[PDB]
Design a protein around this ligand. Structure first.
Ligand SMILES: NC(=O)[C@H]1CCCN(C(=O)[C@H]2CCOc3ccc(Cl)cc32)C1
Ligand SMILES: [Zn+2]
Length: 139
């Protein structure tokens, strides 16, 4: 579990969105596993607007932060699950690192701010759903 709170927006994994998220829906994309809902309180997170390929992510299954090198956002095949059929997920970045089911929602950050959230993982890999191209999160 985990979310990005920026301005009047809350960014979460689409497969983990609540009834409230859907009732206050701004935008959602199954192909990216992202959902953005509206909030009344103001959000304190800063979003990075960069092309960094290094950063630090929070891993709840280890209660620790880990430094990672990660790939550029791309279309990567993701196995079937209770949430989705087998498909290509877009804007996804992979890194060599630990992750387990339950780690989705962990934030990835570089020196510029929030880069994305854990969305996939397994086999010593961890996948992050990028949010740097969503320029409208700030305005
Ligand atoms: N379609 C997706 O983005 C997700 C939906 C939930 C399920 N997905 C995963 O990748 C699961 C499958 C099992 O192994 C792991 C290990 C670590 C992590 Cl962070 C996630 C998973 C795909
Ligand atoms: Zn950066």
């Amino acid at each position: 579990s985990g979310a990005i709170y920026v301005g009047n927006y809350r960014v979460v994994n689409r497969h983990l969105a609540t009834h409230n998220d859907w009732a206050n829906l701004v935008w959602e994309d199954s192909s990216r596993d992202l959902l953005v809902s509206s909030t009344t309180a103001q959000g304190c997170d800063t979003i990075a607007r960069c092309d960094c390929q290094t950063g630090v992510y929070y891993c709840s299954s280890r209660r620790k932060h880990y430094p990672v090198s990660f790939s550029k956002p791309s279309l990567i095949f993701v196995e079937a699950s209770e949430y989705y059929p087998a498909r290509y997920q877009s804007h996804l970045m992979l890194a060599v690192g630990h992750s387990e089911p339950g780690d989705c929602g962990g934030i990835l950050r570089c020196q510029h701010g929030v880069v994305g959230i854990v969305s996939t993982g397994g086999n010593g890999l961890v996948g992050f759903a990028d949010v740097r191209d969503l320029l409208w999160l700030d305005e």
